[PDB]
RNA sequence: GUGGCGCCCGAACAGGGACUUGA
């Protein structure tokens, strides 16, 4: 019955020779406790060290559960085999769901565990669990079947998913559906209670084929940017004017309609940073021009899909965060805000990445204001999703922090 | 050997190499030929002369324990060609992770690599030729091999896994070629299970003694000595040389860092800044009084003996720090007071400019990494720092810095920012517009400041770019200023330096900056751009531009 | 003669911040 597709990397693309960062025993116990069962059900298989390729492992305990599940950091594998899901078996991206009231993310990782896989491709998906204190070498394994965290297995699973979803959505037309990764989306601009009813009906319909499926709920259409607004204190100190003047000079690159002539007129008279300086009619006219501008968005940018996304992020204080997105610099697409520190950060990247999923159908490249060892060590505990973004680290300038207060 | 032998191929589209034999002696020749006969009649090696035109060279030796001309080989022309394997045996087992187990033992292996065969599609590539002359090819795992330890450990684990599942109560740690085995059981049953293990392995053709070092320990293990309930380094001394060389320096540095992991209270920093610029291997450098006072400290520490401990999984463990100053940090780990598991050293410089709390975060996260890789659980903490400081730091900082559960200790010294900054200027304070520049060709920079009163200033400098020019400019400003102050500059460098709030740094001028900044009770800082005509900023930039910007 | 781990010291690539030649 099974007839897997011949799959292969781009020529001139080695496999993932990657290490495995440290782990804890509390996770290792559960990892063994579940991989043994995965191995008994014919899903995976032991090997020797004859193959060098590796791929990391890390545990989770996600929201709406208390188990000890797992997932894999397949970042290199996807980056190197992206041709497969880009041309061989690809799918289009709609743009209707983001204007709808409500959605509901699903998780269908179990169905992937009922289909075999190419034998020539299994050595590119070795995953090692370590042993503490380098006592024993790694208990290596190999994936026999289509694994989670990889963006080629839903690509080929969409064919039988189409025959799965055939009956109901001809009945239920007004719903939009996506399938990016192990997770699944459902567009429903209708009543949220009826949304839940149809979600339960769909869950039962998946159970009909023996599919077990036990943030979670989202409302995208109300999202907007934070238009940069400025104070209106009739009094002004020279500190305020200098701060505003540097703000606008750095913002000039974004908004070409930016003028600071009258504000620079007030500074030829040197004085302290506490006197009052009445803004003339001309200077307040310039303010009003700027404030009428910033209520509007940019005019001249567009979503280039073939490029990559860069989702920068900043910290402000008070437990209040920001985020900025761009393909090319100084051409923004979406900004915003979002209210312990590291937990806020993983929540924020989860939120932003889901937003990117629903809007553009792609995961961005991050630039975080934090060290490498800290995140690499601690991020594994508080994560709750089932996918991975691409990230790096940055040495943040204290002027982009002046984006918002 | 009915073992589950492994398939092994060669790299994509390549061949086995061909080399010439070396010019060697006559005495070793018949001796190593007899060695070859011994290994052959031991059931290891296949002799094939006219098989194929491959010739892997030989590098024999008169190794340690003279007259024992052991068999040797080179494989540098093939190890680059052999297909990669995986290696997770990267680090080493730390003594701490070794658990408190009463009935301990050990079983080494003799000629381990020479007991596993190799796959007949690969025995061709083992051309061991020697002077007519004659060729001899392995059927086994030889040395000089890239994938021999991995195959060795894999087959060993898969062999002893039934033994593991039969007695999971018993612990088995392995290494390159050695077996640290132990339990908390009684000796009549210990040796019984060990003899059953011996017969279990000799079912697969493996060596093991009974007259080994079981009560003969402590062992010697990568420089470590292991008592049953205690442990320590291989015993250490230090040279009494009246002078010092750089080889002598690096020797003792490696020695004490190999001893720092158990010995609390060590200093190396001033004893290692000497190497910067020290690059020749004969330079007789002095024993400068900083280093003299340091190594006297160190020898006082070492003159007393000490021993470590092992780990009990039940009793939760504790970390602690006894800071000893000068950007250096030590750390103790103990499950009970005065019984230290291990210690060490951390004085790295993440950026030449830094503060103390940054270094502390660095240290605790590195200690968490090591405690994870050793035991598998991050520890509870006990740190010399108040909560309000941590709260002020991570609220007024442009990054995220977390630490696990912790608490306060009243162990002097303390950690505290020697100053701070305000987010709001002052009425009655002074304004200071400053700037300063220099040349790429003469380096004869100029710097100064100006107020709103008029008490301006100009200062020339030398041998620098504009960054240190601005820094000396704010220095001269603070020296010419008073008690509180409000300052404005035109550089993001000085702001990025100051607002990190460092208390110690390398070059002397930022040290002077902070030294006189602590005196001024209050201070504001801001930033503005250039080439816009912003008040005094243009004036000063004009005034210092004379003779600089032409 | 070779390889591996550690400590120290030096050369190439990306990002950021600053100074010179042209419409």
Q: For residue B351, how far is the Cα from the chain centroid?
A: 18
Taking alpha carbons only, the member of B3, B210, B207 closest to residue B109 is B207
Helix/strand/coil for A267: coil
Interface test with B, best of A19, A51, A136, A314 (most B CBs within 10 A): A136
**Tokens linked to B518:** 């602590």
Taking alpha carbons only, the member of B342, B303, B348 closest to residue B319 is B342
Among residues 98-137 of chain B, which lie with CB inside 8 Å of chain A?
none
- The string of DSSP codes covering B306-320 is -----B-SSS--EEE
User: In sequence order, what are the beta bridge partners of A142?
Assistant: A45, A126
Distance A314 CA to C12 C1' (A): 32
**Residue reference for tokens 């009813």:** A197
Number of helices and strands in chain A (H, E) = 9, 15
**Partner residue opposite A373 with nearest CB, options B369, B400, B526:** B369
Closest residue, CA to C1' of C15 = A394
Closest residue, CA to C1' of C3 = B144
Give φ, ψ of A205 to 5 degrees: -65, -35
Spatial strand order in the sheet of B134-138 = B45-46, B134-138, B127-130
Contacts of A243 in chain B (CB under 8 A): 526
Instruction: Classify each residue of A315-324 as buried b or exposed e, where b means 16 or more C-beta atoms within 10 Å of its C-beta.
Output: beeeeebbbb
Q: For residue B341, how far is the Cα from the chain centroid?
A: 19
Rounded Cα distance, B307 and B341, in Å: 9
Distance B440 CA to C22 C1' (A): 21
**Tokens linked to B203:** 């079912």
Closest residue, CA to C1' of C4 = B90
**Tokens linked to A3:** 């007839």
Cβ neighbors of B330 (< 8 A, separation 6 or more) are B264, B265, B266, B321, B322, B323, B324, B343, B344, B345, B346
Contacts of A272 in chain B (CB under 8 A): 429, 431, 452, 486
User: In sequence order, what are the beta bridge partners of B487?
Assistant: B432
Q: Residues of A comprising the binding site for Mg(2+)?
A: 107, 182-183
Instruction: Classify each residue of A285-306 as buried b or exposed e, where b means 16 or more C-beta atoms within 10 Å of its C-beta.
Output: ebbeebeeebeeeeeeeeeeee
Which H helix or E strand runs over B456? none
User: In sequence order, what are the beta bridge partners of B448?
Assistant: B435, B458
Distance A392 CA to C14 C1' (A): 12
- The reply to whether residue B86 touches residue A398, judged by beta carbons under 8 angstroms, is no
Cβ neighbors of B120 (< 8 A, separation 6 or more) are B139
Strand C bases contacted by the protein (CB, 7 Å): 1-3, 5-10, 15-20
Taking alpha carbons only, the member of B292, B351, B356, B302 closest to residue B324 is B356
Experimental method: cryo-EM
User: Which protein residues have a C-beta closer than 7 A to any atom of strand C?
Assistant: A 329, 395, 397; B 59, 61, 63, 72, 74, 76, 90, 144, 250, 253-254, 257, 272, 275-276, 279, 437, 440, 465-466, 491-493, 530, 549
> Which nucleotide is closest to the Cα of B257 by its C1'?
C7
Contacts of B368 in chain A (CB under 8 A): 377
How many CB atoms within 10 Å of residue A362? 14
Spatial strand order in the sheet of B339-343 = B318-320, B332-336, B339-343
DSSP state at residue B122: T
Rounded Cα distance, B168 and B189, in Å: 15
Helix/strand/coil for B323: coil
**Partner residue opposite B372 with nearest CB, options A22, A50, A401:** A22
Residue A139: asked if its preceding bond is cis (omega within 30°), the reply is no
- The reply to whether residue B400 touches residue A50, judged by beta carbons under 8 angstroms, is no
DSSP state at residue B139: S
Interface test with B, best of A51, A130, A133 (most B CBs within 10 A): A133
- The reply to whether residue B395 touches residue A273, judged by beta carbons under 8 angstroms, is no
> Which nucleotide is closest to the Cα of B493 by its C1'?
C17
Q: Where are the domains of chain A?
A: 2-90+113-153, 96-112+154-185, 186-303, 304-402
Contact B374/A at CB under 8 A? yes
Which H helix or E strand runs over B121? none
DSSP state at residue A124: G
Q: Residues of A comprising the binding site?
A: 107, 182-183
Cβ neighbors of A175 (< 8 A, separation 6 or more) are A169, A186, A187, A188, A198
Breaks in chain A (C–N beyond 2.5 Å) sit after 214, 339
Instruction: Please report the resolution in angstroms.
Output: 4.1
Closest CA–CA distance from residue A376 to any residue of chain B (Å)? 10
- The reply to whether residue A270 touches residue B173, judged by beta carbons under 8 angstroms, is no
**Tokens linked to B502:** 């460092």
**Partner residue opposite B376 with nearest CB, options A132, A269, A396:** A132
User: In sequence order, what are the beta bridge partners of A44?
Assistant: A143
Number of helices and strands in chain B (H, E) = 11, 16
> Which nucleotide is closest to the Cα of B79 by its C1'?
C3
**Partner residue opposite B402 with nearest CB, options A135, A243, A340:** A340
- The reply to whether residue A318 touches residue B499, judged by beta carbons under 8 angstroms, is no
Distance A142 CA to C10 C1' (A): 43
- The string of DSSP codes covering B367-414 is HHHHHHHHTSSPPB--BS--HHHHHHHHHSSSS-----S--B---SS-
Contacts of A370 in chain B (CB under 8 A): 399-400
- The reply to whether residue B88 touches residue A20, judged by beta carbons under 8 angstroms, is yes
Contact in structure between B360 and B385 (CB atoms under 8 Å): yes
- The reply to whether residue A22 touches residue B151, judged by beta carbons under 8 angstroms, is no
Angle, helices A372-382 vs A342-360, to 10°: value is 80
Closest CA–CA distance from residue B534 to any residue of chain A (Å)? 6
Contacts of B373 in chain A (CB under 8 A): 22, 132-134
Question: Whats the size of chain A, residue-wise?
Answer: 405
Give φ, ψ of B303 to 5 degrees: -60, -30
**Partner residue opposite B532 with nearest CB, options A126, A264, A344:** A264
- The reply to whether residue B369 touches residue A243, judged by beta carbons under 8 angstroms, is no
Distance B39 CA to C4 C1' (A): 26
Handedness of CA A390, A27, A373, A123 (dihedral sign): negative
Residue B513: asked if its preceding bond is cis (omega within 30°), the reply is no
Contact A235/B at CB under 8 A? no
Helix/strand/coil for A91: coil
Which H helix or E strand runs over B457? strand B457-460
- The reply to whether residue B431 touches residue A272, judged by beta carbons under 8 angstroms, is yes
Helix/strand/coil for B443: coil
Which H helix or E strand runs over B358? helix B356-374
Closest residue, CA to C1' of C18 = B466
Contact in structure between A110 and A212 (CB atoms under 8 Å): yes
Closest CA–CA distance from residue B273 to any residue of chain A (Å)? 26
From A127, which residue of chain B is nearest by alpha-carbon distance? Answer: B86
How many CB atoms within 10 Å of residue A152? 23
**Tokens linked to B485:** 């102050």
Rounded Cα distance, A229 and B245, in Å: 66
- CB pairs A-B closer than 8 Å: 174
Angle, helices A153-171 vs A192-207, to 10°: value is 120
- The reply to whether residue A242 touches residue B526, judged by beta carbons under 8 angstroms, is yes
Helix/strand/coil for A126: strand
**Residue reference for tokens 């005509």:** B533
Instruction: Classify each residue of A30-58 as buried b or exposed e, where b means 16 or more C-beta atoms within 10 Å of its C-beta.
Output: bbeeebeebeeeebbeebbbbbbbbbbbb
Rounded Cα distance, B386 and B388, in Å: 6
Rounded Cα distance, A233 and A236, in Å: 7
> Which nucleotide is closest to the Cα of A367 by its C1'?
C15
Distance B18 CA to C1 C1' (A): 18
Cβ neighbors of B550 (< 8 A, separation 6 or more) are none
- The reply to whether residue B91 touches residue A134, judged by beta carbons under 8 angstroms, is yes
Contact A28/B at CB under 8 A? yes
Which H helix or E strand runs over B453? none
Helix/strand/coil for A119: coil
Give φ, ψ of B30 to 5 degrees: -65, -30
From B426, which residue of chain A is nearest by alpha-carbon distance? Answer: A274
């Amino acid at each position: 019955p099974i007839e897997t597709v011949p799959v292969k990397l781009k020529p001139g693309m080695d496999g993932p020779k990657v290490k495995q960062w440290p782990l804890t025993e509390e996770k290792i116990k559960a990892l063994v406790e579940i991989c043994t069962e995965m191995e008994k059900e014919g899903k995976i298989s032991k090997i020797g060290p004859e193959n060098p390729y590796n791929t990391p492992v890390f545990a989770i305990k996600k929201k709406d559960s208390t188990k000890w599940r797992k997932l894999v950091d397949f970042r290199e594998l996807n980056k190197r085999t992206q041709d497969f899901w880009e041309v061989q078996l690809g799918i289009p991206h709609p743009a209707g769901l983001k204007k709808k009231k409500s959605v509901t993310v699903l998780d269908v990782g179990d169905a992937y565990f009922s289909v075999p896989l190419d034998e020539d491709f299994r050595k590119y998906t070795a995953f090692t669990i370590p042993s503490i204190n380098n006592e024993t070498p790694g208990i290596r394994y190999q994936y026999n079947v289509l694994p989670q965290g990889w963006k080629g297995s839903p690509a080929i699973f969409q064919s039988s998913m189409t025959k799965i979803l055939e009956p109901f959505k001809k009945q239920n037309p007004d719903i939009v559906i996506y399938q990016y990764m192990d997770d699944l989306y459902v567009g429903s601009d209708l009543e949220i209670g009826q949304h839940r009813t149809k979600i339960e009906e769909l869950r039962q319909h998946l159970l009909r084929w023996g599919l077990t499926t036990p943030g979670y709920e989202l409302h995208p259409d109300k999202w907007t940017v934070q238009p940069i607004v400025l104070p209106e204190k009739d009094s002004w100190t020279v500190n305020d004017i200098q701060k505003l003047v540097g703000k606008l000079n750095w913002a000039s690159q974004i908004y070409p309609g930016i003028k600071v002539r009258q504000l620079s007129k007030l500074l030829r008279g040197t004085k302290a940073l506490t006197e009052v300086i009445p803004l003339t009619e001309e200077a307040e006219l310039e303010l009003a021009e700027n404030r009428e501008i910033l209520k509007e968005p940019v005019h001249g940018v567009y979503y280039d899909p073939s490029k990559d996304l860069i989702a920068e992020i900043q910290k402000q204080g008070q437990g209040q965060w920001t985020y900025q997105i761009y393909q090319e610099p100084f051409k923004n697409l979406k900004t915003g805000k979002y209210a312990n520190d590291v937990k806020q950060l993983t929540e924020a990247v989860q939120k932003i990445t889901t937003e990117s999923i629903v809007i553009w159908g792609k995961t961005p490249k991050f630039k975080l204001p934090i060290q490498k060892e800290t995140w690499e060590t601690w991020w594994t505990e508080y994560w709750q999703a089932t996918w991975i973004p691409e990230w790096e680290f940055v040495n943040t300038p204290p002027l982009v922090k002046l984006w918002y207060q | 050997s009915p073992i589950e032998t492994v398939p092994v191929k060669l790299k994509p589209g390549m061949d086995g190499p061909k080399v010439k034999q070396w010019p060697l002696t006559e005495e070793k020749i018949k001796a190593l030929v007899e060695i070859c006969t011994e290994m052959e009649k031991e059931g290891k090696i296949s002799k094939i002369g006219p098989e194929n035109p491959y010739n892997t060279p030989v590098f024999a030796i008169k190794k340690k324990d003279s007259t024992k001309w052991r068999k040797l080989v080179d494989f540098r022309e093939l190890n680059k060609r052999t297909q990669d394997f995986w290696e997770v045996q990267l680090g080493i087992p730390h003594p701490a992770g070794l658990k408190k187990k009463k009935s301990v033992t050990v079983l080494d292996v003799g000629d381990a690599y020479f007991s596993v065969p190799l796959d007949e599609d690969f025995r061709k590539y083992t051309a061991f030729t020697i002077p007519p002359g004659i060729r001899y090819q392995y059927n086994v795992l030889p040395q000089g091999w890239k994938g021999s330890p991995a195959i060795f450990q894999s087959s060993m684990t898969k062999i002893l896994e039934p033994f593991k599942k039969q007695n999971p109560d018993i612990v088995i740690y392995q290494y390159m070629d050695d077996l640290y085995v132990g339990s908390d059981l009684e000796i009549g049953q210990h040796r019984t299970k060990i003899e059953e293990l011996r017969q279990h392995l000799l079912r697969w053709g493996l060596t093991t003694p009974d007259k080994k070092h079981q009560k003969e320990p402590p062992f010697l293990w990568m420089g470590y000595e292991l008592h049953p309930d205690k442990w320590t380094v291989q015993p250490i001394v230090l040279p009494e040389k009246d002078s010092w060389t750089v080889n002598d320096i690096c020797k003792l540095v490696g020695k004490l860092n190999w001893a720092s992991q158990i010995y609390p209270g060590i200093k190396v920093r001033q004893l290692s800044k000497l190497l910067r610029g020290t690059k020749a291997l004969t330079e007789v450098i002095p024993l400068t009084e900083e280093a003299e006072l340091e190594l006297a400290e160190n020898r006082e520490i070492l003159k007393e003996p000490v021993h470590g401990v092992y780990y009990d999984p039940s009793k939760d463990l504790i970390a602690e720090i006894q800071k000893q100053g000068q950007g250096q940090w030590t750390y103790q780990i103990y499950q009970e007071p005065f019984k230290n598991l291990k210690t060490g050293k951390y004085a790295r410089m993440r950026g030449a400019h830094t503060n103390d709390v940054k270094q502390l975060t660095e240290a605790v996260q590195k200690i968490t990494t090591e405690s994870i890789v050793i035991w598998g659980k991050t520890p509870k903490f006990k740190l010399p720092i108040q909560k309000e400081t941590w709260e002020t730091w991570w609220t007024e900082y442009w990054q995220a810095t977390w630490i696990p559960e912790w608490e306060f200790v009243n162990t002097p010294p303390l950690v505290k920012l020697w100053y701070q900054l305000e987010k709001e200027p002052i009425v009655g304070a002074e304004t200071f517009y400053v700037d300063g520049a220099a040349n790429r060709e003469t380096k004869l920079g100029k710097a100064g400041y100006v107020t709103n009163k008029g008490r301006q200033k100009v200062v020339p400098l030398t041998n620098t770019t504009n960054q240190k020019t601005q820094l000396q400019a704010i220095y001269l400003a603070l020296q010419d200023s008073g008690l509180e102050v409000n300052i404005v500059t035109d550089s993001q460098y000085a702001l990025g330096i100051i607002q990190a709030q460092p208390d110690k740094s390398e070059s002397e001028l930022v040290n002077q900056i902070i030294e006189q900044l602590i005196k001024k009770e209050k201070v504001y800082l801001a930033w503005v751009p250039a080439h816009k005509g912003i008040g005094g900023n243009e004036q000063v930039d004009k005034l210092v531009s004379a003779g600089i910007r032409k």
